[PDB]
Write a protein that binds this ligand. Structure first.
Ligand code: HEC
Ligand code: HEC
Ligand code: HEC
Ligand code: HEC
Ligand code: HEC
Ligand code: HEC
Ligand code: HEC
Ligand code: HEC
Ligand code: HEC
Ligand code: HEC
Ligand code: HEC
Ligand code: HEC
Lengths: 497, 497, 497
């Protein structure tokens, strides 16, 4: 029989066709989805995880191959001469870097294989000399000459740059649960943080002064999932950054007394430490887990933060501000616990629409409520009630912590990720629960047997989800057995983590 | 009987009165709406379209009249002497422009009527010498001395600056469908782009260095309708713009090798081309129409973009990034097609509340479903289901394209106009559909004849809409017959377009 | 029986415990809320209002106490020597201020007790000489040497910096209605504006050039409650600020002809006036009250604004722009009045779910509809219908005024706080009303007696609200009797205001 596309075609007078043939499809109505070319993904879900081939740039050790049309073995100077014409800005950047200009070097004492690096570090030194065997580097290259910074970059725990891709892309439910082309940006954002040294001081200038600015962090550290850029920007610190950025001296090292206005790097890469996670009190899954950072057991961490603030403030003032965070965070969890009780209550009474068996299976292949143990908390392919629940804990409750940590008066109270947004979300959740309960009570009284709509279970997008494909023995548990990396507590991990 | 205002008056003790009399109305409850003074609008709907008189500044050829109290015929120097006192910044701007200062001229070779312009171009040269017959210019004036830039500015197709007002204000459903004072900003934003030469390099400095900055575009190129500023700003390019803006040389022409960080103008006004639309692969109604820009038939356009990126990147890298766009866009349309099926399904089963006959007529004067052929897709004066549908296609699906085109990792996936926002909107749409279906099933079983509420059809705002006033013969179809401008495919156009 | 925490504990294997003991609680599920240490709040609700002890910094006259561990009586030079080590940036700021550096003084003629201040104004001059009796100042200190600026800062009416905390924190429903730690940022934002002189030109540099920038206002003047920063930033003025900030001369006094680009301070602190409220036509509760500022009775104010704009524009142009504001504002109230009729209609027909007696009492201790006289308009602890109503009047209708006042073409029409957001909110409100009415009609026909869910009335957060604690005689009406400050028209004020 006719598909949606077939019917649309008959009404609009545009033939059905493949999405990728170049036709301009009116409202995309008569286009058929085609699977892009994929490569196999890595990690514990390698049996079905895919990536677009462009993963070559971000996990080059496992995916990089020669794809150049230019042949020859060249000297550094020859790289520069041709690329001056062919990719001019790369050469301009490099000429303005310490690698390509001795005049701006600071005599740091850089060594390779125990010997001082006194020459230019040219294109060929990083990419190789043979244009048919060019190399696309990771931090492994930089380690040859910058071992201190690399060791620190590799010193973080789960939730740090160190494992952002290897663990928190390849094991993450929201990534593995979706078609590869939908989440390319997830792989790359997290992979840039882990595998590269250019997330903060970009190629090819590699300028530490650039890395000190909030712009070195905010492309990644933003949004409803983790809104720390907005929290910082809407603090007095952030306003002063905007006011002073144009005329302040960004060439000064991150040190006590060198800056009036603190930035992300100042507070988190203290004294140039390339393991920024380590200053945090404790990893809390972005504030979705509740912890009082002002409790006696965390005194050393709290005192360390107070001393950091004391670069520019009374320590009594700083202590008071961090206590406001503790108090505000603890109040915020009362609203989440209210939400959770309402939501789980609906599931236990069997009034959620759809119920889990009425939806597509989750990415484990289970028909399991998303906000119970063993489920997959999410915002997609689930009930409205479960969506709103996820929004409450992740987008709002987590960000209340971020608002307090960064001194955003407005976002603690009124704004995005605030107390008052929590209030409004709680009203939304209760509203959904109330509607569900009223429908169920009416249907019971009149003897109407409600069946959840088929659109909760099947559709052009829902039919693409990996939950449909899951089968016994499709998990690489040897990956989860690894002890050289941490792991996520996934329901199908199959082993101790 | 008493109106809302009358009842409110009796409860609050504030008399009913006209909104425009200067009274401070408590929550605006007892104020009566008054129609502002209008002038007639232009275009195919001129029989009922209105504008506020302030349209004089933006379509001066058709609306400008003398409104000055100052009399005299003056020389350029006299304009300057008096306006130094009367409008100081205009004079300061002009004195800092090439028009008013020979010292900053570049010897471009500007001519008027075949003769070199060697004098100052003063207030009177652009506005006239008689203060009771002052002129308010458009690009027609600038063409006298800058024919190349003007020709390019006038070379675009539908969806470009060239027809932004003449076609895409005067023929646009959302503009013609609303009271004039509600949409003044629409007329002016679109009219500034079309009729003026000051949208990017503002009067009275007319500084190209200003026009090269993203600030020259983002006042217009923003928001949930078309969020390209945010997409750019949340890319690494955008972060580098913020980092480098204060110290970079904006005086350099937009040319390969002159910039490290690309801006809107760099990529879209390539080499100073004043027809920025022409570099686009194809006009797609802001990404609401699906097209694979990586398909064989679009190879020339794709290769041109790759070469643009190659100013600062490997062309293989650029090609991969643009393929990610193609793939991400194609996946995004699966969710829209799901949404559309759910929404139209509800209409075909007769369970939408209100149904079209329960709402105010659309701007054509029809009681027609908004998301069917011949309807008016919209976010106002319609059902919640239809609102959510419009939000899905315009605000979200269109912006997924914008997120990929501009390399915003976060907004492709998590953020505003992203895949995950599409997911959440799809849950909202299914939720509305499910509620509608459950109500209809209950009402059928118990024999309750539901009538949609009167507030869907009538109210103080809804009663102002032009749909109520539409009648046969009220369209100027001669306008649509014009072949010197393109046209929108409006349901009542009455002729071939 | 088991609480939510007890049940969660049994399912997750984490013991129940107090939120403040430092345990990392999985999704905060097994943590019990503990009341933070409070101090008593001031104002008419002092019988139950609380503050966190950190209020010491913001209302120091009533809460400041010695909390230093350092003992001694010191000379100014000694303060500097030690704090160079102990709080370096404070000293660096002070050394770069006129107080601490004669070289940057302008010979203003500053006097204390009728005598010229010719020495440095050091740490001890502002904080005292005894480290166990240090002072935390307000504007009262600054008045000793800057009486003109202080008098103006203290000259505003309700809705100005002058009474931001004393009246609009201590008397405000949303503040007094919530646990103290939830609204700390409210107290501090409003208290910084009232009690300090560092909101715009921050300590310890106290630089007027900093205060002239929009960054001096936007930390407070932002968001869905009052979005003037975004309105300004998305105007051409705001784009030009961003374009010119890095290279423009911010050292010039706010005067006609000194600036190309107007900022908040330029337009509102005209010629350096420290009572910025006074230039407004009339206080309108942030545009929630409707007034036509172009009406004959407001001509003097309108003419004054036109003349301000004429620093850089034709006064005819300016007049037209302010008339667009008047017209756009008046149209916006038609949609609010529609919303209000729908919402109140539902209450009068008894179909709101919950009805007021089904919710927790409001902060007065009443079970009263929030959008009727005597009620408490709010977004929390109320029905979805009432939430949406508050969002319509405060977040949207109020901000339409802000969008027009600040020349944001996009936000007048499409964007945040716009006409089209009003449209969408109106659809949401009608949708809620329609659902409520359909449920009520079904339940009546089948004889089902609906009881609103218990979660509308009780829960871990709702149980903390002050409405439960209210009792006769708990209002300090002597506060409301004061005539030296204005007051809010609270339902339980008990006296004439
Ligand atoms: C040895 C062969 C090197 C390799 C491999 C990499 N870099 Fe390097 N780096 C090298 C030298 C000789 C210098 C100059 C030292 C001096 O005396 O000044 C640098 C400098 C840097 C810097 C600081 C730049 C600045 O302007 O202050 C950075 C941030 C940097 N290098 C980064 C970096 C990265 C990310 C690398 C891997 C891709 C990398 N370097 C490789 C020598 C060598
Ligand atoms: C000092 C004044 C800071 C600046 C500037 C920025 N942040 Fe921050 N951050 C700061 C504190 C005191 C905390 C709480 C840590 C604690 O244990 O008490 C945080 C928190 C974060 C986090 C979460 C870290 C964690 O949970 O362990 C992140 C990811 C973070 N901050 C990032 C971040 C960014 C991107 C910033 C610039 C935009 C930024 N911070 C500014 C202190 C300070
Ligand atoms: C952001 C999180 C960064 C990442 C990821 C990496 N670097 Fe970095 N780097 C960053 C900052 C903010 C600074 C300045 C710090 C300061 O003390 O002011 C730097 C500096 C460097 C340097 C210069 C060191 C010196 O002696 O002057 C080098 C050589 C360097 N960074 C290298 C480097 C490498 C090899 C990285 C990957 C492993 C790397 N950086 C990542 C910010 C960030
Ligand atoms: C008057 C002109 C002052 C001089 C001189 C100094 N300070 Fe100050 N300080 C002043 C005020 C009005 C305030 C209150 C906060 C506000 O913004 O109004 C403060 C605050 C402090 C604080 C606490 C706040 C903090 O950021 O930690 C400290 C620790 C402080 N001041 C110390 C200090 C020192 C060491 C000074 C000399 C170098 C100094 N202040 C000068 C006003 C004035
Ligand atoms: C002839 C009578 C002119 C008319 C009419 C307009 N302009 Fe012009 N323009 C004119 C001259 C003689 C020059 C200087 C040329 C030189 O040799 O440098 C210019 C310059 C400009 C520029 C570039 C300014 C810069 O600083 O680089 C711009 C952007 C410009 N003019 C814009 C412009 C517009 C928008 C006009 C219509 C309103 C317009 N010009 C009229 C001469 C004449
Ligand atoms: C180069 C690095 C770019 C910069 C900087 C900006 N944009 Fe862009 N844009 C770019 C590409 C490769 C595309 C896709 C075009 C294609 O056919 O593949 C776009 C798209 C747009 C569009 C839509 C154009 C169309 O559909 O034909 C608009 C309106 C647009 N971009 C505007 C825009 C603005 C305002 C920017 C600065 C904020 C901006 N772009 C940056 C490339 C680049
Ligand atoms: C934004 C979309 C623009 C509009 C609309 C107009 N101009 Fe423009 N102009 C713009 C930029 C980004 C630049 C610099 C381009 C570059 O190559 O770097 C310019 C430049 C000019 C110039 C100077 C040309 C020269 O030879 O140096 C002129 C004379 C000029 N622009 C005129 C002009 C006119 C007449 C316009 C209306 C028809 C117009 N511009 C619109 C950006 C934009
Ligand atoms: C080591 C210090 C490097 C030197 C010297 C040069 N490049 Fe490089 N480049 C380097 C890294 C680590 C990467 C991977 C991306 C990242 O940010 O980590 C790259 C990338 C490239 C690319 C592809 C990416 C792109 O933007 O197109 C190209 C085409 C490239 N590099 C070329 C290049 C040339 C011509 C150089 C000499 C002028 C050069 N690189 C220097 C590290 C280093
Ligand atoms: C007298 C003992 C003072 C007290 C108390 C405060 N300030 Fe002051 N201030 C004082 C002097 C002698 C000067 C320099 C005057 C001159 O001739 O230039 C100032 C200056 C300022 C300024 C302007 C600074 C500038 O760089 O232009 C500001 C904004 C200022 N002072 C603010 C200020 C505040 C907020 C105070 C209370 C906390 C305060 N001053 C106290 C003398 C005295
Ligand atoms: C001049 C060009 C202005 C700039 C720059 C900013 N604002 Fe403004 N504001 C301006 C006008 C003409 C009005 C309307 C006043 C009237 O009576 O017609 C306003 C309004 C406000 C308000 C409300 C004031 C009131 O209701 O009385 C506020 C709080 C406000 N503006 C603040 C503000 C801020 C924070 C700005 C920078 C971000 C800003 N304004 C810019 C004129 C101008
Ligand atoms: C923002 C709303 C401000 C607040 C609150 C206070 N001040 Fe201010 N101040 C502000 C600006 C924008 C300026 C520059 C104004 C101009 O004309 O350009 C100033 C300036 C001062 C000065 C210098 C006066 C002089 O003669 O040069 C002083 C002494 C000053 N301000 C003091 C002061 C005091 C005592 C305040 C609290 C009562 C105060 N300011 C608050 C902005 C703002
Ligand atoms: C041509 C190159 C011009 C010269 C020389 C001057 N102005 Fe102008 N002005 C010009 C245009 C094309 C416009 C229309 C608006 C637009 O952006 O296209 C204007 C506008 C004005 C206005 C009204 C708008 C306003 O901001 O109030 C006035 C009052 C005005 N111009 C005055 C003026 C004076 C006094 C001049 C000499 C110093 C002057 N203009 C020069 C184009 C040109």
């Amino acid at each position: 029989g006719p598909t949606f596309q077939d019917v649309a075609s008959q009404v609009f007078g545009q033939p059905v066709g493949p999405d990728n043939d170049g036709t301009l499809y009116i409202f995309g109505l008569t286009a058929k989805y085609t699977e892009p070319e994929y490569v196999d993904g890595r990690g514990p879900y390698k049996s079905f995880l895919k990536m677009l081939p462009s993963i070559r740039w971000y996990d080059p050790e496992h995916y990089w191959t020669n794809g150049s049309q230019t042949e020859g073995v060249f000297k550094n100077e020859e790289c520069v001469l041709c690329h001056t014409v062919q990719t001019p800005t790369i050469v301009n950047d490099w000429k303005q870097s310490s690698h390509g200009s001795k005049d701006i070097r600071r005599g740091i004492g850089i060594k390779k294989d125990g010997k001082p690096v006194e020459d230019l570090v040219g294109c060929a030194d990083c990419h190789g000399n043979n244009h048919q065997k060019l190399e696309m580097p990771t931090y492994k290259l930089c380690n040859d000459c910058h071992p201190k910074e690399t060791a620190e970059h590799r010193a973080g725990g789960l939730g740090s740059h160190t494992h952002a891709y290897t663990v928190n892309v390849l094991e993450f439910s929201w990534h593995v649960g979706k078609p590869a082309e939908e989440v390319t940006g997830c792989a790359h954002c997290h992979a840039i943080a882990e595998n590269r040294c250019s997330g903060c001081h970009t190629r090819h200038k590699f300028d530490p002064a650039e890395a000190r600015k909030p712009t070195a962090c905010r492309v990644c550290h933003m949004g409803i999932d983790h809104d720390e850029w907005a929290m910082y920007n809407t603090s007095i610190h952030g306003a002063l950054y905007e006011a002073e950025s144009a005329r302040m001296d960004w060439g000064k090292k991150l040190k006590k007394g060198n800056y009036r206005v603190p930035t992300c790097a100042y507070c988190h890469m203290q004294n140039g430490d390339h393991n920024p996670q380590r200053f945090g009190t404790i990893y809390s899954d972005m504030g979705m887990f509740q912890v009082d950072r002002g409790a006696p057991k965390h005194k050393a961490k709290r005192d360390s933060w107070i001393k950091l603030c004391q670069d520019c403030h009374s320590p009594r003032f700083a202590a008071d501000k961090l206590k406001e965070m503790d108090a505000g965070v603890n109040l915020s969890f009362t609203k989440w616990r209210e939400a959770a009780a309402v939501i789980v209550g609906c599931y236990l009474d069997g009034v959620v629409d759809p119920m889990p068996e009425g939806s597509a299976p989750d990415w484990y292949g289970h028909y399991t409520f998303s906000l119970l143990p063993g489920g997959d908390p999410r915002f997609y392919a689930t009930s409205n009630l479960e969506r709103l629940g996820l929004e409450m804990i992740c987008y709002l409750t987590g960000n209340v912590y971020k608002a307090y940590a960064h001194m955003s008066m407005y976002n603690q109270t009124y704004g995005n990720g605030s107390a008052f947004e929590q209030d409004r979300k709680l009203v939304e959740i209760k509203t959904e629960a109330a509607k569900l309960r009223r429908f169920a009570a009416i249907e019971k009284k009149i003897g109407l047997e409600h069946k959840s709509a088929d659109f909760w279970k099947h559709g052009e997008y829902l039919d693409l989800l990996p939950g449909w494909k899951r089968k016994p023995g499709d998990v690489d548990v040897e990956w989860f057995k690894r002890t050289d990396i941490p792991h996520r507590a996934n329901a199908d991990a199959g082993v101790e983590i």
